[PDB]
Scaffold this active site. Structure first.
Site, short mmCIF file in Angstrom:
data_model
loop_
_atom_site.label_atom_id
_atom_site.label_comp_id
_atom_site.label_asym_id
_atom_site.label_seq_id
_atom_site.Cartn_x
_atom_site.Cartn_y
_atom_site.Cartn_z
CB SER A 1 -0.91 0.04 1.22
OG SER A 1 -1.94 -0.92 1.09
CG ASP A 73 7.75 -7.23 16.70
OD1 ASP A 73 6.70 -7.87 16.92
OD2 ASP A 73 8.88 -7.70 16.93
CB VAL A 75 2.84 -10.58 16.76
CG1 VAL A 75 2.49 -12.01 17.13
CG2 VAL A 75 1.65 -9.88 16.13
CG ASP A 76 6.98 -9.88 21.25
OD1 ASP A 76 7.46 -9.65 20.12
OD2 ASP A 76 7.07 -9.07 22.21
N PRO A 205 12.87 -8.51 20.46
CG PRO A 205 12.41 -6.57 19.25
CD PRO A 205 13.29 -7.10 20.36
CG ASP A 252 8.60 -10.93 14.63
OD1 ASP A 252 8.22 -11.66 13.69
OD2 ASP A 252 7.98 -10.85 15.71
C1 LIG Z 1 0.40 -9.11 6.41
C2 LIG Z 1 -0.06 -8.20 5.25
C3 LIG Z 1 -1.57 -8.04 5.28
S1 LIG Z 1 0.70 -6.55 5.46
C4 LIG Z 1 1.18 -6.34 3.71
C5 LIG Z 1 0.35 -5.50 2.73
N1 LIG Z 1 -0.71 -4.65 3.27
C6 LIG Z 1 -0.68 -3.33 2.91
O1 LIG Z 1 0.21 -2.93 2.16
C7 LIG Z 1 -1.69 -2.31 3.40
C8 LIG Z 1 -2.82 -2.48 4.29
C9 LIG Z 1 -3.09 -3.63 5.01
C10 LIG Z 1 -4.23 -3.72 5.90
C11 LIG Z 1 -5.02 -2.62 6.01
C12 LIG Z 1 -4.82 -1.51 5.34
C13 LIG Z 1 -3.71 -1.47 4.49
C14 LIG Z 1 -0.06 -6.84 2.14
O2 LIG Z 1 -0.76 -7.24 1.24
N2 LIG Z 1 0.75 -7.55 3.05
C15 LIG Z 1 0.37 -8.73 3.81
C16 LIG Z 1 1.57 -9.76 3.79
O3 LIG Z 1 2.68 -9.35 4.17
O4 LIG Z 1 1.32 -10.91 3.37
CA LIG Z 2 8.11 -10.00 17.93
#
Ligand SMILES: CC1(C)S[C@@H]2[C@H](NC(=O)Cc3ccccc3)C(=O)N2[C@H]1C(=O)O
Ligand SMILES: [Ca+2]
Lengths: 557, 206
Positions: A1, A73, A75-76, A205, A252
């Site tokens: 995003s 981060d 979440v641990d 962390p 992390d």
């Molecule tokens: C864990 C994630 C959901 S975070 C990353 C990315 N999300 C975004 O770029 C923006 C966004 C996420 C949630 C709510 C609003 C905006 C996206 O897609 N990623 C996921 C991943 O790493 O697999």
């Molecule tokens: Ca962590």
């Protein structure tokens, strides 16, 4: 995003401009839902994922807001001590505490039902177990118990009319999310919202901690600690999943880094390129970043250094010169299949080879595989999400930066070898690989472009539509699943605010029983492809003047 | 009229809801949602609660198990029960709105039932505040704010220590998975501020 907010000092023909490009992947029907709410203290317009009560992307005529994942981060993992005797218990603070547990039965269509047990400790739900050393891992979220507060904060923030009221709601949003603010007076702001643990001294962390009690979080950090800025000296706010703030630690996840190499710099240079931007120019940043190869800028200097002393006819030098003329902006050939320039394919093959020679060589298997992706890997259907600089590429970048990198190179990724030698050998692989496939005349290389697919399965991989409802777009665009722009105090409009968004395929996913598709089933799909946009209405006058249908319900609770 | 909900769609079919109080406002929201995206929302509900195998069969059992192992429904319901009447009205109104349309769909399915339901062999049921809440919780919290690889991270560090020895292995872990990189481009310029907290990066919890 990604998101860029242009403040009063950099907006042209306006006081503030907000362009949001949340990247969730692409889906049919649309990931987000257009909605306007007018009453009960609300007066908003925009669109939102899965139609949450709270609009993640929209405005109320006085302020506008947006988001991108925070990647802090929050979440641990706690390592709980178990015992062969007293199963279902775990040692915490000197006593054997009983775990929480519940029975679940998975009913299965045309199959056998399955019942199993889920376990939880004071630290979180149990992941995997290991009755050798008798250890189970509990995942601890800083936002635990704040899910609904975050949902309500996203709703109530829509009623804010200034920075103070808005940050009040941002303080209650516990998930790790970047929030963005802009208003009619030209003000702009950013908050790295989220609940973050106050860890014991010495708690790394990045690695698990004992769950016996001594490593329990002291609590949660106060809102004061959350990175935030209001009306920055720079006059703009840009993010593309990059770091919030100096010294702020990232998630992390081993596959995720904030380092010298960051795609957000692509947005920065375009916003800094001109003193001021108009609404249309700020919007145009979508197209540009959508097509921008993210690795050219990072590695071209190294490529140039390594090939500066080669003769005209050296093929590897020919490949770098090709990249040197290129602005990294991919465009499709008239065939709608290939890219006019072979730049990304060259970078892809080269980078893949470098990683194999450097980062991957230095890491013990099977962990080495974690750093081998060039970041261009995709399927015939195209990327499932955004394109980014790969974790291996980011580590490599630090290495070719030499002393200009603040990261101690404990081990030499280049194994004592001249950096130029390795770069050249990778260019040698690249030429051999590519020339054998496309011929030796680079100027007529027609390398395949990435395509884009609005998928019929939601991000979980679960069908949200029939398979035939999947839609195809020839040109992959590294842009938001939806794009919305709010322009405050536009000088050429009679209204104190203007807004636009694009929700593809369309507002409606309805297909009647006879297979008759809704009039708004796909009326935004071409618009998405062409970087077009449609107006979002807010006032009663604009909504009325643009009404196609109406309905009135009479109901009491 | 306190009981009146007006729904006006623009020329892209985007719904605007007009209502006096909270319950009515979100009742109207859920209504238009059930009209536009009923099947998508039904499948999202099943995704966030791990009930997909119920209608799609065996290949989603692992998926369903994983979803349920990743959260604690009672905890969610407890938070819902603690909501003020005002905040509750949001979820309840939203849920009631969908149900108002879902009831109309199941009463005249031959004209109003989204094709996908017929195709996937089932019909929609009513929603409660829990379901609405879990849409958000399962698609934003449990999946977009729930990231960690600490167990693997420790495995990598362990392998690096075996390969390069203790000190060198720790230093290489700090090279591949640094806690912070001061050259990292930031959304907030250094002139504005910096983050006050510094964490330990030597794994002293062992
Ligand atoms: C864990 C994630 C959901 S975070 C990353 C990315 N999300 C975004 O770029 C923006 C966004 C996420 C949630 C709510 C609003 C905006 C996206 O897609 N990623 C996921 C991943 O790493 O697999
Ligand atoms: Ca962590």
């Amino acid at each position: 995003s990604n998101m860029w907010v242009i403040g009063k000092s950099k907006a042209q023909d306006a006081k503030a401009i907000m362009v949001n490009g949340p990247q969730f992947g692409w889906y049919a029907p649309a990931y987000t839902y257009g909605i306007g709410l007018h009453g009960a203290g609300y007066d908003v317009t925009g669109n939102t994922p899965f139609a949450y009560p709270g609009l993640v992307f929209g405005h109320n005529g006085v302020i506008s807001w947006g988001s991108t994942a925070g990647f802090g981060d929050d979440v641990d993992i706690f390592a709980e001590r178990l015992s062969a005797e007293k199963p279902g218990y775990y040692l915490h603070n000197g006593k054997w505490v009983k775990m929480l547990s519940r029975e679940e039965t998975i009913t299965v269509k045309n199959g056998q039902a399955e019942t199993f047990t889920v376990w939880r400790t004071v630290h979180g739900n149990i992941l995997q177990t290991d009755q050798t050393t008798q250890t189970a891992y509990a995942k601890s979220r800083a936002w635990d118990g704040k899910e609904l507060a975050s949902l309500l904060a996203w709703t109530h923030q829509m009623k804010a009319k200034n920075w103070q009221e808005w940050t009040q709601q941002a303080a209650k949003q516990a998930l790790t999310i970047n929030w963005y603010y802009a208003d009619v007076n030209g003000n702009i702001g950013y908050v790295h919202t989220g609940a973050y643990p106050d860890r014991q001294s010495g708690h790394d962390p990045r690695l698990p901690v004992p769950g016996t009690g001594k490593w329990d979080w002291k609590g949660l950090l106060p809102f004061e600690m959350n990175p935030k800025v209001y009306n920055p000296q720079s006059g703009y706010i840009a993010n593309w999943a990059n770091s919030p703030q100096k010294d702020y630690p990232a998630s992390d996840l081993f596959a995720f880094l904030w380092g010298g190499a960051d795609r957000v710099t692509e947005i920065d240079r375009l916003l800094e390129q001109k003193p001021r931007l108009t609404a249309d120019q700020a919007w145009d940043v979508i197209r540009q970043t959508s097509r921008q190869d993210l690795n050219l800028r990072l590695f071209l200097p190294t490529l140039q250094a390594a090939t500066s002393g080669l003769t005209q006819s050296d093929p590897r030098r020919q490949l770098v010169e090709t990249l040197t003329r290129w602005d990294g902006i991919n465009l499709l050939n008239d065939d709608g299949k290939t890219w006019q320039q072979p730049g990304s394919a060259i970078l892809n093959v080269w980078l893949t080879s470098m990683l194999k020679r450097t980062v991957v060589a230095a890491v013990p298997m099977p962990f080495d595989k974690w750093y081998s992706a060039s970041g261009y890997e995709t399927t015939q259907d195209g990327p499932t999400g955004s394109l980014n600089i790969s974790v291996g590429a980011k580590i490599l970048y630090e290495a070719v930066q030499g002393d200009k990198s603040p990261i101690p190179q404990a081990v030499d990724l280049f194994a004592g070898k001249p950096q130029q030698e390795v770069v050249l050998a990778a260019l040698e692989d690249t030429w051999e690989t590519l020339s054998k496939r496309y011929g030796n005349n680079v100027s007529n290389w027609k390398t395949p472009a990435m395509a884009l697919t609005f998928r019929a399965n939601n991000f979980f991989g679960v069908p949200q539509a029939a398979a035939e409802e999947t839609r195809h777009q020839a040109e992959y665009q590294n842009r938001g699943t939806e794009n919305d722009m709010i322009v405050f105090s536009p000088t050429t409009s009679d209204r104190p605010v203007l807004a636009w968004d694009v929700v593809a395929p369309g507002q409606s996913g309805f297909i009647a029983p006879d297979g008759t598709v809704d009039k708004h089933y796909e009326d935004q799909l071409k618009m998405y492809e062409n970087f077009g946009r449609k107006s979002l209405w807010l006032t009663k006058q604009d909504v009325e003047a643009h009404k196609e249908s109406q309905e009135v319900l009479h109901v009491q609770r | 009229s306190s009981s009146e909900i007006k729904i006006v769609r623009d020329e892209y079919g985007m719904p605007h809801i007009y209502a006096n109080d909270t319950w009515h406002l979100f009742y109207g929201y859920g209504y238009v949602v059930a009209q536009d995206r009923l099947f998508q929302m039904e499948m999202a509900r099943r995704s966030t609660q791990g009930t997909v195998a119920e209608v799609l069969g065996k290949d989603f059992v692992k998926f369903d198990k994983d979803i349920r192992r990743n959260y604690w429904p009672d905890a969610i319901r407890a938070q819902i029960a603690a909501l003020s009447p005002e905040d509750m009205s949001i979820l309840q109104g939203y849920a009631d709105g969908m149900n108002a349309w879902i009831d109309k769909v199941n009463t005249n399915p031959e004209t109003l039932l989204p094709k996908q339901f017929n195709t996937f062999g089932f019909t929609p049921k009513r929603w409660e505040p829990f379901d609405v809440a879990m849409i958000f919780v399962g698609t934003m919290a449990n999946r977009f704010s729930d990231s960690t690889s600490e167990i693997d991270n420790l495995a990598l560090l362990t392998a690096l220590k075996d390969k390069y020895g203790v000190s060198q292995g720790m230093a290489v872990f700090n090279q591949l998975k640094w806690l912070v990189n001061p050259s990292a481009p930031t959304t907030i310029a250094v002139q504005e501020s910096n983050y006050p907290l510094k964490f330990n990066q030597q794994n002293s919890q062992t």
